[PDB]
Amino acid sequence: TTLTLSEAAPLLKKEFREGRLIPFLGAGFSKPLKLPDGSQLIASLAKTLGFEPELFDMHGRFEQLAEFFAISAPNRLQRLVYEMSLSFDSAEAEALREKSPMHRALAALDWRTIYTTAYDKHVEGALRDAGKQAAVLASFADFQGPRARDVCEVIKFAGTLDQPDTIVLTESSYFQRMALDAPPDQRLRADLLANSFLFIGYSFSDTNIRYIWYRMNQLREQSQLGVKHSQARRCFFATHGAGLVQPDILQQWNIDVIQLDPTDKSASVARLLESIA
Amino acid sequence: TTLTLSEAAPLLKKEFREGRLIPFLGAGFSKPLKLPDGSQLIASLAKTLGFEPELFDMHGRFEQLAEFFAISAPNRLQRLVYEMSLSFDSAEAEALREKSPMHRALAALDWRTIYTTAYDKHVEGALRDAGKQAAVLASFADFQGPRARDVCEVIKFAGTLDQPDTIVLTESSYFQRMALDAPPDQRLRADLLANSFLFIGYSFSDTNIRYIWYRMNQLREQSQLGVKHSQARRCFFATHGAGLVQPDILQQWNIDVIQLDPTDKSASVARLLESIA
Amino acid sequence: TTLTLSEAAPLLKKEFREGRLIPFLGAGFSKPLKLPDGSQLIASLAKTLGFEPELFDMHGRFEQLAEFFAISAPNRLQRLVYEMSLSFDSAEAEALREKSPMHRALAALDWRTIYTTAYDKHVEGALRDAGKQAAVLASFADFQGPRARDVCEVIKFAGTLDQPDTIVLTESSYFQRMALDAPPDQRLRADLLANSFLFIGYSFSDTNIRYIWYRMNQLREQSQLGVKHSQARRCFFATHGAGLVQPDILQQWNIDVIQLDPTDKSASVARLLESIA
Amino acid sequence: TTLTLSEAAPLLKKEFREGRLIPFLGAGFSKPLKLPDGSQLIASLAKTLGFEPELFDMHGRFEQLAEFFAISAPNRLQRLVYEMSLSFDSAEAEALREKSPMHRALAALDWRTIYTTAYDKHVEGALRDAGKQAAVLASFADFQGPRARDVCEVIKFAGTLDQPDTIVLTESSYFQRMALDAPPDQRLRADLLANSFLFIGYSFSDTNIRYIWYRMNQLREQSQLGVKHSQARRCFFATHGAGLVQPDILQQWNIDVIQLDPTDKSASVARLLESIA
Amino acid sequence: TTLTLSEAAPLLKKEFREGRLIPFLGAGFSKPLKLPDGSQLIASLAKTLGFEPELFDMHGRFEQLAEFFAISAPNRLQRLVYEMSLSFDSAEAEALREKSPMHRALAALDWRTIYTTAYDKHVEGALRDAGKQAAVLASFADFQGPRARDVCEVIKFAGTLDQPDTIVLTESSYFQRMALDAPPDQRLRADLLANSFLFIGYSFSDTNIRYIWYRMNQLREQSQLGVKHSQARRCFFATHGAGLVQPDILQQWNIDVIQLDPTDKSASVARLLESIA
Amino acid sequence: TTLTLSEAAPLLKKEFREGRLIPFLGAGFSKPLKLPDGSQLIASLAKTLGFEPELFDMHGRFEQLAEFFAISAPNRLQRLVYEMSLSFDSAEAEALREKSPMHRALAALDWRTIYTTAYDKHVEGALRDAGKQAAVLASFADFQGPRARDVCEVIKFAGTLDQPDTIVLTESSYFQRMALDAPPDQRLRADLLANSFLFIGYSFSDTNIRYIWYRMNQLREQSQLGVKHSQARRCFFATHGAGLVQPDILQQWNIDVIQLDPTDKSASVARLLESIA
Ligand SMILES: NC(=O)c1ccc[n+]([C@@H]2O[C@H](COP(=O)([O-])OP(=O)(O)OC[C@H]3O[C@@H](n4cnc5c(N)ncnc54)[C@H](O)[C@@H]3O)[C@@H](O)[C@H]2O)c1
Ligand SMILES: NC(=O)c1ccc[n+]([C@@H]2O[C@H](COP(=O)([O-])OP(=O)(O)OC[C@H]3O[C@@H](n4cnc5c(N)ncnc54)[C@H](O)[C@@H]3O)[C@@H](O)[C@H]2O)c1
Ligand SMILES: NC(=O)c1ccc[n+]([C@@H]2O[C@H](COP(=O)([O-])OP(=O)(O)OC[C@H]3O[C@@H](n4cnc5c(N)ncnc54)[C@H](O)[C@@H]3O)[C@@H](O)[C@H]2O)c1
Ligand SMILES: NC(=O)c1ccc[n+]([C@@H]2O[C@H](COP(=O)([O-])OP(=O)(O)OC[C@H]3O[C@@H](n4cnc5c(N)ncnc54)[C@H](O)[C@@H]3O)[C@@H](O)[C@H]2O)c1
Ligand SMILES: NC(=O)c1ccc[n+]([C@@H]2O[C@H](COP(=O)([O-])OP(=O)(O)OC[C@H]3O[C@@H](n4cnc5c(N)ncnc54)[C@H](O)[C@@H]3O)[C@@H](O)[C@H]2O)c1
Ligand SMILES: NC(=O)c1ccc[n+]([C@@H]2O[C@H](COP(=O)([O-])OP(=O)(O)OC[C@H]3O[C@@H](n4cnc5c(N)ncnc54)[C@H](O)[C@@H]3O)[C@@H](O)[C@H]2O)c1
């Protein structure tokens, strides 16, 4: 009911040599860089607001606790972006990034489009370390702006720290993205029409991602394909700790789960990216 | 930062005598009828699937565990509706409903529209007990069908057990309601343009409700009213156990919190409905 | 294939005594007040821009010629609203309005909601002449504002001249209303769920009206009613000069055509409104 | 106020050598193939229905007369598609297509994406004549299906005759495309984020095209770019017979008009496509 | 044991002047129009699928190889119908149809019902060439629709290319016709109760035809007629190349074989149709 | 795309220990008994009729050549049954049946129902050799007659040689079985509702078998199960020489193909039946 690493490796080679595989990277892809995930940000937001980190986490979801932080005082969200910039894109986080085996194995492949939901320059920065060049596309002016003819376009689906208006962190920013009208939303839905995705380091907890794959399956069911042909194009979801309910919800949406070895989380991902090559 | 019962009582009399107050009832309004809430359904779904109820609750949200139940076997969702009808609308639940002080105090007021998110006939059934007559509107055929000129219209926002196609319980049904195209969705958004709502027994955990009050705030901010006039029309949120984060999120959306006495949850609501009269 | 006046008269009495009939008034309802229709505005916009009125009408539709007028010079649209106010709501147009037999026959009936697409105060002003009182609702602040317990609400679907931001006349304003997010758009779609409409003086040329009745039939077809029950609730379209193609397009959308006598257009409408009483 | 052929020629070379120019072809691109345009179809639909062709055109727009044709009898639309196949993609229309100077000059350039609103195989068929290979993408199964690594993708925006469910010809089919949910609609809106378009043989009469460029300007105005940077990325609209109103409406939407010589309409387009090379 | 042309000619005159003779035309009736039979379609289906035409034929019957073609890819059957319409009903196939001596001799007789198992308009199109008018009946809507008082009804037993839902080509479509519930199946079984049939250009290889004549003989045997009276009403089977087994199987079913001259297959059929006149 | 012996072995153990696996045996199961298949009968029918065996086969299918044999002379079919008895159920065919490894491995399993389409007592006779007892059910009197409480019922789907009226060999006998009214037809369709079948030694060439699995899938599709649940119950088709078209036709009908080793056809089947134990 769940693919292993050796079973999913020839399925990822076929989609990559056709140029129809696109990585979708999450917050967990920057964990060997000693960066906070969605839980240690809330531990840092509770320290500023005067909460205890265990008591503050019981007052709502991740989207709702950041909305409470941004309206506690004026210019409180701007300060967070400044602090995050100092800690996510620091010089010691760049030094851990050349010697990271995942970021070397990601940049060794010749991708054309990479989607990320992280606030750091460590995905396109891994491409600059391997001699390649990337193109960060986060806002409307980036898509309209000039780029080289053949460059891996890194689509910042959540925003970038150098453009603080594009960051979706609070609940009102996620509700603004429910209309699927943003330029990262329009680019994702057109690439999902024709390409397989590889989810690495991302867990389907945001309802803005789960709603896009819902309405792609709707176009699939109304097109009245057979049992054989509607199950042909799959997506892949590499996760060390997938439960029992969530892999069966995603079988509806043509998303296969790749079970990685949870003992060393960094080396299990690196062996997946080297098996595509 | 939170209204009490005596403070919010003259604010509810003014909106009621103008005919601009509409109750929004949740699952907690049927708790003195000894009915399961959203937690004891999951304890019953885990018993059928072979899970332990504490282990099954850690694999996702309420929307996602019901989606996992409905796809475990064919005709598994239909059986649940049949079982729910035997336990929610039973004869012993009707007998506890005439002697319930909340259902007597609700039907004593001359309402015109009541919104509910519960799967039981105990809100309109309380109106039949007081000699009044109600009109259940859940599907498109109910809105098109005939009704008395002046009858309290009970809008089943989540569906009714006698029309099992209207029930939104699984995650795919909540994503179908995100487009705000259903007849309960279109009727709610037009009544929110001109009326105050009174939330009783409902906790803002569903993202389909929180997204409607978000977009209402959009129409409000783009209309460029002042500080005084954009804060004039309020909504009221009676809750025994509101935390510290959630009342401040709802101040953005013109929703005031009424703190009820948590010692006796049944009598605190009944004193609120008698203070409107 | 088309109802006459005597055939449609008992069908309009039944929906009116149930309180489920709502008039939809167009620009043609103000033609006995000697006001310009959509053709004499274009003859006045061409005189300002330096065009001949016959040459200016061949360069695009009514929506597109007003968009060209509004961007010819700064503050050009505001001047038009000021001029329209001087000519539509003048004192000699009010004097022709008490002695108009259509406006007397409209105000003699006890309506609850009237939708209008004409930029003038001659529909609610006819209600003030008969001793009744009305409530103009055009913007978001009007729906939020205070009204009396029971007062016929006149919904300005196109806007009002005393609130020039609500006027939809140019093409960019009609494209802004395609999202169906405006408060007149949300109120219309919820009243269409449960009520019959009577189109008087309006011709279905705007694609914002034809798109609403399209998506109400979609909810009707997906609900899988029978042949008998999906054709039960009709709408009525009184028109002196309906062609051969347009009455058959509207049979899809449960809209019946009432053929009025084209010799005297003012008296044919007045006999329809007196036959409802 | 309007570019000529020699002025717009270096502006089209710059966008083509960067790979950011995409042709948008209309019904007028197949006029040297002696095929009917939108006016001679209506002359053929009126002959079947028993109308005179001059009387039938005065009963509504092109979208509305085809809706009237499709509901006159059962299986009346299927017959039209079959008849159109016999006349549009006939053998004598293919023989006029190798010796056509526009189709030779179109296939001489190394495009990557071509959008067409025509139901015929003479745009991708021109690419097969020049030794190149194309990929017709019209339905959801085409985007999901296999293609080669690098092949010019011809996006049938209106549908193809070999898949009669994808054809948008009647008014109900254009209203179904207003939601912008179709796979040609989602692919167009993502390519418009980053590319210049070249409109050849198409006149902006369909409100489904004019609404897409409206909402791309919304993203542009809300992003708060300057006067210089919001006017940087243009689109080009080659037309022999543009009027006086329509070129100024499209300056709002960053669409420049290229005036071609109306004496020989076939040779004026061919000199434009050879000036890009 | 087999009738010749001169022997069967007075037997066909007697059934024709009584109005009790009905032609049953097959795929071989369109062979002078240079159209593919059931063998050259399989040679064209093997070219698309990548098979060699000699290796593809050894993998199953004609019904089974078309079922394999239709499920190889989505929208693969709708592509075939479009391609067939370009080649069967082309303009050069119509030009060979006026000068064909069989189609002239068929239309010279005053028939009332013609059954055909070919997908093309060259049987009713031969009737339009002789000044007569025909009525194609293929689907349920054709039988319900209006026709003139007296017009030869051409029953498309296999379907027509302008209604692609009626085409029976794949194996699942032949199994759907085994229930004998289709409107061409119900019309054939009632005409077989009272009329002689003339099989021209058809070989009894489909098990849906052989099963109808089986169950008409079952009615004959249970009615307990004598040896003389059960053999009175015959059917006629004109074939150039009937073997040794198949003419004796059909003597059970009151089907006589007319041996035509196999040197010129076109002129042998034309002398049969002129001998009926 | 095709299961091997080791892959299909745990899938057959699960259905057997639940008691939901039923063998379907063909003519090829008696080939190590040196019995004629469907090709050497035709070589024996051609010798009686005076044909050459290579010329006789080109005159029709297996069903049609036996129909020609039975009507060549009176009492010609009765003689064939008598001759077949002398050769199929002879004493030297029984002596090869105890030492046959397939018949030992078939009788070692504790079956409850076995379907056969062969004319010999070597399937139930293998059960008598292993000490077990069987019950031959071929006609209506066998189903009505007495059997023991628990005895493997051998359903002769084609008939038995000791009841010559039940033998379906000629074409008129197969057309009599198309109505699915025979007691072997009614018993098969009810066991197919709830059980997996294992096809051994049978090739899907008879259209009476392929039509039953067609109409079981029709019930499956009208019941509107999902993609996961409609593919749950499979059937298994062990064949040494399956082609390229026929395994893909049967994927529609939930029939999986087990590829056996074609070098030794007797030992490959015996290793399959021993892998179930
Ligand atoms: N600048 C950043 O990197 C950053 C940091 C915190 C939050 N955020 C934003 O807030 C959102 C919430 O973050 P989240 O982490 O809670 O959810 P998430 O879905 O983005 O990350 C969780 C996933 O990371 C994976 N993961 C954890 N450790 C890993 C490892 N060592 N190697 C590979 N994968 C590993 C988990 O298995 C899990 O599937 C994020 O999606 C992001 O938009 C960004
Ligand atoms: N037929 C039913 O009544 C029923 C039962 C379970 C679930 N559901 C559906 O599933 C959803 C989840 O149910 P949920 O209960 O978890 O969410 P909920 O928001 O509807 O109910 C929680 C609210 O009930 C209030 N409440 C609890 N006890 C109360 C009392 N004695 N008096 C007054 N209020 C009380 C809580 O304070 C809390 O605010 C529901 O919204 C519903 O759509 C319906
Ligand atoms: N302040 C105004 O009254 C005014 C004036 C011009 C335009 N407009 C706006 O521009 C839009 C276009 O105006 P339009 O008139 O071209 O379209 P319209 O559809 O609103 O009016 C046309 C309809 O008026 C009817 N009509 C004409 N004369 C009539 C009469 N004597 N009695 C009853 N009905 C009569 C026609 O039969 C026709 O059905 C309008 O809908 C409006 O929004 C408003
Ligand atoms: N199979 C087809 O080609 C076909 C034919 C008719 C209609 N249609 C469909 O119906 C729609 C309406 O068709 P339409 O023609 O009225 O609108 P259109 O906008 O598609 O075509 C009109 C444009 O063609 C241009 N044009 C005319 N002659 C030309 C020439 N010789 N060279 C270059 N350009 C020329 C006109 O200047 C004008 O700008 C079409 O968009 C299409 O979807 C398709
Ligand atoms: N549009 C078409 O005409 C067409 C083409 C191919 C297949 N099909 C369909 O597929 C089925 C299989 O086609 P098939 O041809 O193999 O079977 P068939 O039974 O329809 O045709 C065989 C018959 O054609 C006759 N025939 C051959 N040449 C002839 C000639 N020159 N004059 C008169 N008769 C001639 C043969 O004697 C033979 O009896 C067809 O029945 C049809 O339903 C239709
Ligand atoms: N008394 C008999 O056994 C007998 C003999 C001849 C014909 N018949 C009847 O006429 C029909 C036609 O017979 P048919 O054989 O041509 O069709 P069939 O489908 O019954 O047999 C073909 C199958 O036999 C299998 N087979 C061949 N050799 C085998 C072996 N050594 N081990 C296992 N399987 C083997 C083939 O793989 C093939 O799948 C039969 O179905 C039957 O009803 C019965």
Residue D57: both structure tokens together: 């055109």
Q: Which residue shows structure tokens 């609750």?
A: B57
Q: Which residue in chain B is spatially nearest to A61 when comparing CA positions?
A: B205
Q: Which helix (H) or strand (E) holds E21?
A: strand E21-25
> What atom in ligand 2 is closest to the CA of residue B32?
31
| D15 contacts on A by Cβ (under 8 Å) | none
Asked whether the beta carbons of residue B245 and residue A171 sit closer than 8 angstroms, the reply is no
User: Do D168 and D150 touch, CB atoms closer than 8 A?
Assistant: no
| C225 contacts on B by Cβ (under 8 Å) | 141
Q: Confirm or reject: Cβ of A40 under 6 Å from ligand 1.
A: no
Q: How many CB atoms lie within 10 A of CB A118?
A: 23
| Euclidean distance between CA atoms F59 and F55, whole angstroms | 7
Q: Do chains D and C touch (3 or more CB pairs under 8 A)?
A: yes
Count of CA atoms in the C-beta half-sphere (13 A) of C49: 26
Q: Which residue shows structure tokens 């080509």?
A: E169
What are the φ/ψ torsions at residue B208 (nearest 5 degrees)? -80, -25
| F1 contacts on A by Cβ (under 8 Å) | none
Q: Which residue in chain A is spatially nearest to F230 when comparing CA positions?
A: A227
Pick among D207, D221, D250 to test the C interface (most C CBs inside 10 A): D207
What three-state secondary structure class fits A238?
strand
Pick among C244, C246, C251, C257 to test the D interface (most D CBs inside 10 A): C244
Look up residue F169 and give its DSSP letter.
-
Asked whether the beta carbons of residue A175 and residue B252 sit closer than 8 angstroms, the reply is no
| Euclidean distance between CA atoms A116 and A112, whole angstroms | 13
List the single residue in D82, D91, D145 with the smallest CB-CB distance to E85: D82
User: Do F109 and F25 touch, CB atoms closer than 8 A?
Assistant: no
Q: How do beta strands B255-259 and B235-239 pair? A: parallel
| Euclidean distance between CA atoms F110 and D17, whole angstroms | 75
Q: Confirm or reject: Cβ of C239 under 6 Å from ligand 3.
A: yes
The resolution of the experimental structure, rounded to one decimal in Å, is 2.6
What three-state secondary structure class fits C202?
coil
Q: How do beta strands B235-239 and F152-156 pair? A: unpaired
> Which chains have 3+ CB pairs within 8 A of B?
A, C, F
Residues 6+ apart with CB under 8 A from A66: A41, A45, A169, A170, A171
| B64 contacts on A by Cβ (under 8 Å) | 245-246, 249
How far, in Å, from the CA of F10 to the mean position of ligand 1?
A: 40
Q: Do chains A and F touch (3 or more CB pairs under 8 A)?
A: yes
**CB environment D178-202: b (16+ within 10 A), e (fewer):** bebebbbbbbbbbbbbbbbbbbbbb
Torsion angle (degrees, nearest 10) of CA F139, F141, F142, F145 = 170
Q: Which residue shows structure tokens 């054939």?
A: E188
Pick among A217, A220, A225, A227 to test the F interface (most F CBs inside 10 A): A227
Helix E183-191 to helix E207-222 angle, to the nearest 10 degrees?
A: 40
Q: How do beta strands C152-156 and C196-200 pair? A: unpaired
Q: Which residue in chain B is spatially nearest to A179 when comparing CA positions?
A: B179
CA C154 to chain centre: 11
Count of CA atoms in the C-beta half-sphere (13 A) of F107: 20
Residue E194: both structure tokens together: 């009272």
Pick among A229, A230, A231, A233 to test the E interface (most E CBs inside 10 A): A229
The residues facing D21 across adjacent strands are D196
Q: Which residue shows structure tokens 């989602």?
A: D186
| Euclidean distance between CA atoms C44 and F92, whole angstroms | 110
Residue-level length of chain A: 277
User: Do D190 and A186 touch, CB atoms closer than 8 A?
Assistant: yes
In testing the pocket of ligand 3, which one of C37, C103, C240 has its CB within 8 Å of the most ligand atoms? C37
Q: Which residue in chain B is spatially nearest to F228 when comparing CA positions?
A: B71
| Euclidean distance between CA atoms C84 and C120, whole angstroms | 9
Beta-carbon contacts below 8 Å between A and F: 7
Look up residue F194 and give its DSSP letter.
T
Q: Whose CA is nearest to atom 13 of ligand 6?
A: F38
Burial of D17 (0-12, 13-18, 19+ CB in 10 A): exposed
Q: Which residue shows structure tokens 């309506």?
A: C111
Q: Which residue in chain D is spatially nearest to A183 when comparing CA positions?
A: D193
Which approach determined this entry?
cryo-EM
What three-state secondary structure class fits D25?
strand
CA B181 to chain centre: 19
Residue F236: both structure tokens together: 């298994």
User: Do D163 and E78 touch, CB atoms closer than 8 A?
Assistant: yes
Cα R_g (chain B), whole angstroms: 19
Asked whether the beta carbons of residue B190 and residue C186 sit closer than 8 angstroms, the reply is yes
Q: Confirm or reject: Cβ of A203 under 6 Å from ligand 1.
A: yes
Q: Where are the alpha helices (H) located in E89-182, listed in sequence order?
A: 91-98, 101-107, 124-129, 140-144, 171-176
Asked whether the beta carbons of residue F225 and residue B73 sit closer than 8 angstroms, the reply is no
Counting ligands in written order, the one closest to the CA of D269 is: 4
User: Do A7 and A241 touch, CB atoms closer than 8 A?
Assistant: no
DSSP string, F109-135: S--SEEEE--SSSSSHHHHHHTT--EE
Asked whether the beta carbons of residue B64 and residue A243 sit closer than 8 angstroms, the reply is no
Q: Which residue shows structure tokens 């390519």?
A: D191
Q: Do chains D and E touch (3 or more CB pairs under 8 A)?
A: yes
CA B31 to chain centre: 13
Residues 6+ apart with CB under 8 A from D127: D107, D133, D134, D152, D154
Q: How do beta strands E255-259 and E21-25 pair? A: unpaired
The residues facing C123 across adjacent strands are none
Angle (nearest 5°) at CA D96 between D91 and D98: 100
Identify residue E112 by its one-letter amino acid code.
Answer: R
Mind telling me how many Å the CA of A235 is from chain B's nearest CA? 19
Helix A183-191 to helix A207-222 angle, to the nearest 10 degrees?
A: 40
In Å, how far are C251, D114, D152, E62, F104 from D108, measured between CA atoms?
Answer: 50, 13, 12, 43, 73
Counting ligands in written order, the one closest to the CA of A37 is: 1
User: Do B74 and F225 touch, CB atoms closer than 8 A?
Assistant: yes
Q: Bin C60: left if φ > 0, else alpha if -120 < ψ < 50, else beta.
A: left
Strands (E), chain F: 21-25, 113-116, 134-137, 152-156, 196-200, 235-239, 255-259
Residues 6+ apart with CB under 8 A from F265: F28, F31, F240
| Euclidean distance between CA atoms E135 and E108, whole angstroms | 17
Q: Which residue shows structure tokens 């056509």?
A: D100
3-state SS of chain B is CCECHHHHHHHHHHHHHCCCEEEEECHHHHHHHCCCCHHHHHHHHHHHHCCCHHHHCCCCCHHHHHHHHHCCCCCHHHHHHHHHHHHHCCHHHHHHHHCCHHHHHHHCCCCCEEEECCCCCCCHHHHHHCCCCEEEECCHHHHHCCCCCCCEEEEECCCECCEHHHCCCCHHHHHHHHHCCCHHHHHHHHHCCCCEEEEECCCCCCHHHHHHHHHHHHHHHHCCCCCCCCCCCCEEEEECCCCCCHHHHCCCCCEEEEECCCCCHHHHHHHHHHHHC
| Euclidean distance between CA atoms E124 and E135, whole angstroms | 8
Residue F37: both structure tokens together: 């298949």
| Euclidean distance between CA atoms F103 and F269, whole angstroms | 10
